[PDB]
Amino acid sequence: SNIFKLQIDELLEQVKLKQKHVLKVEKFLHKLYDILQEIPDWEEKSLAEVDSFFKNKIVSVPFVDPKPIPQNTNYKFNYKKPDISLIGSFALKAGIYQPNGSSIDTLLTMPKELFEKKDFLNFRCLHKRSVYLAYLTHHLLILLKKDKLDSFLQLEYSYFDNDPLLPILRISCSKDYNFYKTRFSINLLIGFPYKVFEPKKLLPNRNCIRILPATPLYNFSVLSSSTHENYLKYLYKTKKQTESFVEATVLGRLWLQQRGFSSNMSHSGSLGGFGTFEFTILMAALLNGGGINSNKILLHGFSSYQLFKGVIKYLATMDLCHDGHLQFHSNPASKYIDEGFQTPTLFDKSTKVNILTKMTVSSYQILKEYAGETLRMLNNVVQDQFSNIFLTNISRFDNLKYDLCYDVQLPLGKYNNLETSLAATFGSMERVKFITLENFLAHKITNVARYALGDRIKYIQIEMVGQKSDFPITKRKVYSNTGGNHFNFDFVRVKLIVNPSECDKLVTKGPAHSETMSTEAAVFKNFWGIKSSLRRFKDGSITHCCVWSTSSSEPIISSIVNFALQKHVSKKAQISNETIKKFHNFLPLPNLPSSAKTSVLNLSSFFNLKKSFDDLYKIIFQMKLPLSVKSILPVGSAFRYTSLCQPVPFAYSDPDFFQDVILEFETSPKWPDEITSLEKAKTAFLLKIQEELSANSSTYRSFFSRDESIPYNLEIVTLNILTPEGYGFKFRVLTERDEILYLRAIANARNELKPELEATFLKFTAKYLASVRHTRTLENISHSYQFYSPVVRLFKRWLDTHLLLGHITDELAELIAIKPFVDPAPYFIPGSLENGFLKVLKFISQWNWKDDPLILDLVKPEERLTLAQYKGIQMNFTNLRNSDPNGTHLQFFVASKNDPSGILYSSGIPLPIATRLTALAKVAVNLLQTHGLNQQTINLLFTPGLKDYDFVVDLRTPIGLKSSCGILSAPSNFPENLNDLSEKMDPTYQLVKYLNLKYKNSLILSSRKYIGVNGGEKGDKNVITGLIKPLFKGAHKFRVNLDCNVKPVDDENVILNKEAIFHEIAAFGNDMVINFETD
Amino acid sequence: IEDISAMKNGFIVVPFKLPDHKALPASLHFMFAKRHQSSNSNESDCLFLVNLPLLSNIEHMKKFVGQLCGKYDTVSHVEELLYNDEFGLHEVDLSALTSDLMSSPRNTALLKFVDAASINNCWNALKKYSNLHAKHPNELFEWTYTTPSFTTFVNFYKPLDIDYLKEDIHTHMA
């Protein structure tokens, strides 16, 4: 807790530009408001002739629907002069310099005796507002034409704060007196006087409007458009009170900006409705109140970060919407009533206004948990995440922020076709409640989404995409037939963040069925109808249900949104997300009985080989060695729920088929003191296990395979039990005389062989010792992080399409992918598979190696990495980075409590492969922000390679191996000899491993190790890409230690023996090798 | 250009062919050779051999020797090959590095002789082959690939045979 105020001063130094971008803006501001001073008065009229006054004139007049008729509006217009001051962000000096450009604020208040005391009937108060600004802007365009500034400024009718019932006039400049640099637009918004009425008609429950529904939008909008200066009056009172306020408002407003809550409005489908001035007036309320015993929660005698802490702790803890609120008055305490209004509420007595009624229940419901999450990530003293809490824009992409996104195409036709296209109601009470059809059906579609899902998702957000908040003078509103309607969108993004525990629960229960059936059960069977059902279970429990059909491609969340869309809001709408099905059938389908109708969170094949290992586990405990088994325990990918083609029985060509599993015996003192004798003694134990197993449990098949992964000990022989249930296991023996034997090898090795022997011991520690706690923490974390297993499955599919997986280890990819789960901040936990995968890609693009490590605490939410251990991993990361500054050999530093060293999983990977990973992730993120998620977008995201690689050796196996690998578009037995598995399996990965292991100084190779996860439908084609070292850019002369294959042409120079070396590759695999290409 | 057939310090280029590939439209491999002696056992009277193919075992280096003997009647006592760490499996000896006994450069090979007549005969003979292949590379004696690679090395998925590793473990423990 020492760098935070330096971060405050640093972010302020980036944000202040407070003379050169603002003094000439004040100059043009002086010009504009003295122009509007010099605009004169205008007298009594009637709208039945102001229509002909605006008949063929260039100006137009905005309104709300319905358009005014002269019959019920025998109406009058007067034009007097307000005296202007400055308001808000500019007047409190909080200008933020976006590439987009913030707005500015202006004052057009209103006198008293030009309008009567009955502005509470059918919006003609805002009609005289509209005609007022219409004549003012026509005289402003005349003053444009006579003050010669026609060529560069532009006047624009607009919807103020995305509200169709408040129009404004914004000047924006288009290409001494012309200007384009700082934030652009100036507006022309109105004000009404302060005291207009009697005290009982400003509570938003009231009605006075035509055929008692409340009009909360109406009697909040007239109140907001009346009081735009009381807020600044007590705001400057609090400004005279506190010194913390400008720093408070600037850090709160860029907080709200980089998490996307703008102050437009939330009703018509926009993430936002909460903003900086609502934030500051509730800050001042919480400053001079906040307790039931009048506890002033904030004291205003100290700095800004603690007031930020206090105000977001308040608005994160204390609930405002569903049950009561604290209300405050100004002309000043605050106190809690417990009356929930089904609306985010905070109430006044000086203004008597409900300020957050511009903002929806769903937007408050998601913003409160944004605030709870930012409490969670700035109440932890261990890390430093100012970049997470104030720097990264989490709203800039449409799918890191939300788990699921669907289209809602609405080809409803026209406003008069709405009757028999829209399946909801369209009547007097609903359009006098919700002002426009856009926010009406947005509210209705959020309600039917929440009732269709309930606890099956966390939070909902709707947005009308393509919504436009400005319109030219040539048309009275927006009138553009976009996407199939005359309405202010083209289609609808429905967006979900999901409770991952109940994604694919195929029964959503209603109430229990009593005889006189309950009213919410009636609502349930009205909502479901043909799909609703009366129900009992295996415990004898009657309820109301509806069942679903789980599929690997389509999750049932899509079908339940499809049903609740094509029943209750339209019949001819279209709902789809083909991206979801695209990566869901990128994931390999196992050859299991009824495996197309399984889910994606289904771990049943993993449970099946776990049970077969339990049977082998029992029959290997119950036997007798001369030295009995201490612990047999599994360590493989199928046991930490990670293999791509999840294991079907009898699948030879799966390289994850043979599962790694480690047994250890007692701590016997009779181990031999030498490494090859120790390996042969361990295999003597394995030979006795094999002979007793083949003696008694004859239904298991067994052979021996020589391990070659640990370098320079050629005696490691592993056996291979082939279960009758259809699985294979690589049994190994761990002793207590191995790690101390390798450490004394480090000791008495030759002095220039210590890094090579430490590489050997790091491969040993990564394989036997640390892998056990690795698979423990991953198996124990997968059941709280339920999308982790499929996001690693297609993350390694992605990584094998791009064929880095022969170099980057599996466990390194597992740690890379568990980073956005154990630390999802500032984003949330991935509740969908695409969300997890592109959060992985976004992080590994965004993450820089040399300055920052990647620590990660593998713990479930709500054992954890403490401050001392965190500083220790920072210290040995610092030691690694100042022993090597630019990452020559140690290229990723990932570390946990299971590995404080960091070197373990990332050793032996080359710099072209590591930079290929980072560069390809940055290409992916750049392409996603270029085009967005589309079918061809995902398709070239998963296309293999086609970049600056230099060899393409093209390969086929004499038989396709997806039948015998378990990916279906049948193997069920083992042959009479256990050597036909050789020609049923593929050689390509270990052959290219020997190629790289011999050519390791001259060039690096690669291959796709899983041949038919990525190699076509037949499952046959694999590539081998070579890449010459940057050392071999010229033509060296022959030395003794340069490790190449040479073709000298002159006396001095040698060159790569290229043709003969890829011919020798072709001879080493010529039954497999069928084609060669240079780039 | 091929007529350069003598390097800076004693090196000899020995070229030979590569056989047919199904997707290649004169694939040529070189060896480098010097020679050296010492007072020790097998590092005496020995030629260096650089840029040797994949897993060059005994018997096809021996058919190379045998076609030289059946061609020019050279004196040649070579029937074992020394110090071919082909892929990189024997840089250290971890057994003697953590053991009581068994004690006592990159991509090079170490081909001994026993006779001064044999080393001078093979030296000037292969120098004459280097010169004649330098001015005409056409129909030299070549690489008879009666495949050693697919038999003597395809063991990666072949299981280790039971009685063989039983006898190995038994004699080593004994």
Count of C-beta atoms within a 10 Å radius of residue B47: 20
Tell me the CA distances in angstroms from A821 to A782, A786, A893, A905, one per residue in order: 10, 10, 18, 19
Q: Please name the amino acid found at residue A953.
A: V
* Minimum distance, in Å, between the CA of residue A98 and any CA atom of chain B: 58
Give first-to-last CA distance, chain A, whole Å: 54
How far, in Å, CA of A284 to CA of A278, rounded? 10
Q: What is the 3-state secondary structure (H, E, C) of A694-713?
A: HHHCCCCEEEEEECCCCCCC
Interface test with B, best of A652, A676, A691, A707 (most B CBs within 10 A): A676
Q: What are the start and end residues of each CATH 6.10.250.2760 domain in chain B?
A: 115-174
Using alpha carbons only, what angle is made at residue A937 by residues A926 and A1009, rounded to the nearest 5 degrees?
Answer: 95
Q: What are the start and end residues of each CATH 3.30.70.3020 domain in chain A?
A: 398-506+550-576
> In this structure, what token pair is assigned to residue A841?
């890609």
Strand partners, A662: A633, A732
Helix (H) or strand (E) holding A634: strand A629-634
How far, in Å, CA of A391 to CA of A499, rounded? 27
Can you give the length of chain A in residues? 1079
Per the CB < 8 A criterion, the answer to whether A295 and A336 are in contact is no
* Burial class, B144, CB count within 10 angstroms (exposed 0-12 / middle 13-18 / buried 19+): exposed
Extract the runs of DSSP E, i.e. beta strands, from A43-124: none
Question: Which ranges constitute the DSSP H helices of A119-196?
Answer: 124-146
Q: Please name the amino acid found at residue A812.
A: L
B29–A1043 CB contact, under 8 Å: no
Question: Which of these, A86, A57, A59, A64, lies nearest to A169 by C-alpha position?
Answer: A59
State the DSSP code for A873.
H
How far, in Å, CA of A1046 to CA of A1032, rounded? 11
Instruction: Tell me the technique behind this structure.
Output: cryo-EM
Helix (H) or strand (E) holding A404: strand A404-409
Whose tokens are 């099946």? That residue is A608
State the DSSP code for A160.
G
Interface test with B, best of A680, A688, A689, A1050 (most B CBs within 10 A): A680
* Minimum distance, in Å, between the CA of residue A622 and any CA atom of chain B: 24
Kindly state the greatest CA–CA separation across chain A. Answer: 112
* Burial class, A680, CB count within 10 angstroms (exposed 0-12 / middle 13-18 / buried 19+): buried
How far, in Å, CA of A833 to CA of A600, rounded? 9
- CATH code linked to domain A947-1079: 3.30.70.3030
Per the CB < 8 A criterion, the answer to whether A818 and A858 are in contact is yes
How far, in Å, CA of A589 to CA of A797, rounded? 13
Per the CB < 8 A criterion, the answer to whether B160 and A704 are in contact is yes
State the DSSP code for B82.
B
How far, in Å, CA of A793 to CA of A638, rounded? 11
User: What 3-state class would DSSP assign to A131?
Assistant: helix
> In this structure, what token pair is assigned to residue A526?
């009205």
Contacts of A442 (CB under 8 A, 6+ apart): A267, A268, A269, A462, A464, A492
Q: Phi/psi of residue A869, each to 5°?
A: -70, -35
Contacts of A818 (CB under 8 A, 6+ apart): A778, A781, A785, A788, A856, A858
User: What 3-state class would DSSP assign to A630?
Assistant: strand
How far, in Å, CA of A306 to CA of A247, rounded? 11
Q: Which residues of A633-661 are buried (b: 16+ CB within 10 A; e: fewer)?
A: bbbbbbbbbbbbbbbbbbbbbbbbbbbbb
How far, in Å, CA of A740 to CA of A593, rounded? 49
Count of C-beta atoms within a 10 Å radius of residue A321: 20
Question: Which of these, A589, A555, A654, lies nearest to A969 by C-alpha position?
Answer: A589
Extract the runs of DSSP E, i.e. beta strands, from A898-1020: 951-956, 1003-1004
* Minimum distance, in Å, between the CA of residue A674 and any CA atom of chain B: 5
Q: What are the start and end residues of each CATH 1.10.1410.10 domain in chain A?
A: 1-16+192-201+242-397
Half-sphere exposure for A75 (CA within 13 Å, toward CB): 24
Extract the runs of DSSP E, i.e. beta strands, from A466-618: 470-471, 491-497, 533-535, 543-545
Handedness of CA A408, A411, A415, A417 (dihedral sign): negative
- CATH code linked to domain A1-16+192-201+242-397: 1.10.1410.10
Tell me the CA distances in angstroms from A446 to A360, A362, A403, A507, A510, one per residue in order: 10, 8, 16, 21, 20
B98–A675 CB contact, under 8 Å: yes
Nearest residue in chain A measured CA to CA from B99: A674
For chain A, percent helix, then strand, then coil, each to nearest 5?
40, 10, 50
**Per-window interface: A 999-1038 vs B, CB < 8 A:** 1000-1001, 1038
Q: Does B169 touch chain A if contact means CB atoms closer than 8 Å?
A: yes
* Minimum distance, in Å, between the CA of residue B58 and any CA atom of chain A: 18
The CATH number of B115-174, from 1.25.40.340, 3.40.1410.10, 6.10.250.2760, 1.10.10.10, is 6.10.250.2760
B95–A994 CB contact, under 8 Å: no
Nearest residue in chain B measured CA to CA from A744: B98
Q: Does A3 touch chain B if contact means CB atoms closer than 8 Å?
A: no
Question: Which of these, A333, A334, A329, A354, lies nearest to A344 by C-alpha position?
Answer: A354
Helix (H) or strand (E) holding B30: strand B28-36
* Minimum distance, in Å, between the CA of residue B73 and any CA atom of chain A: 30
Q: Please name the amino acid found at residue A927.
A: L
Whose tokens are 């999308």? That residue is A787
Whose tokens are 């929806």? That residue is A360
How far, in Å, CA of B102 to CA of B96, rounded? 5
Nearest CB to B157: which of A982, A994, A1050?
Answer: A982
> In this structure, what token pair is assigned to residue A106?
């202006």
> In this structure, what token pair is assigned to residue A162?
């995305």
Q: What are the start and end residues of each CATH 3.30.70.3030 domain in chain A?
A: 947-1079
> In this structure, what token pair is assigned to residue A552?
């690997």
Per the CB < 8 A criterion, the answer to whether A769 and A633 are in contact is no
Helix axes A437-453, A556-565, angle to 10 degrees: 130
Extract the runs of DSSP E, i.e. beta strands, from A258-340: 325-328, 334-337
Contacts of A278 (CB under 8 A, 6+ apart): A263, A355, A356, A359
Per the CB < 8 A criterion, the answer to whether A275 and A255 are in contact is no
Helix (H) or strand (E) holding A28: helix A23-38
Q: Which residues of B touch A979 (CB under 8 A)?
A: 157-159
Per the CB < 8 A criterion, the answer to whether A493 and A463 are in contact is yes
Nearest residue in chain A measured CA to CA from B107: A1043
Q: Which residues of B touch A1059 (CB under 8 A)?
A: 18, 27-28
Using alpha carbons only, what angle is made at residue A982 by residues A977 and A984, rounded to the nearest 5 degrees?
Answer: 95
Strand partners, A496: A404, A460
Helix (H) or strand (E) holding B108: strand B108-112
State the DSSP code for B169.
H
Question: Which ranges constitute the DSSP H helices of A656-809?
Answer: 675-696, 739-748, 754-764, 770-781, 788-801
Tell me the CA distances in angstroms from A210 to A48, A69, A94, one per residue in order: 22, 15, 43
Question: Which of these, A842, A936, A841, A931, lies nearest to A578 by C-alpha position?
Answer: A936
Q: Does B102 touch chain A if contact means CB atoms closer than 8 Å?
A: no
Helix (H) or strand (E) holding B14: strand B12-17
> In this structure, what token pair is assigned to residue A871?
């500083």
State how beta strands A629-634 and A658-665 pair. Answer: antiparallel
Helix (H) or strand (E) holding A90: helix A88-91
How far, in Å, CA of A772 to CA of A855, rounded? 19
- CATH code linked to domain A398-506+550-576: 3.30.70.3020
How far, in Å, CA of A343 to CA of B147, rounded? 82
State the DSSP code for A344.
-
B159–A979 CB contact, under 8 Å: yes
Walk across the sheet containing A1073-1078 and list its strands: A1021-1024, A951-956, A1073-1078
B169–A748 CB contact, under 8 Å: no
User: What 3-state class would DSSP assign to A544?
Assistant: strand
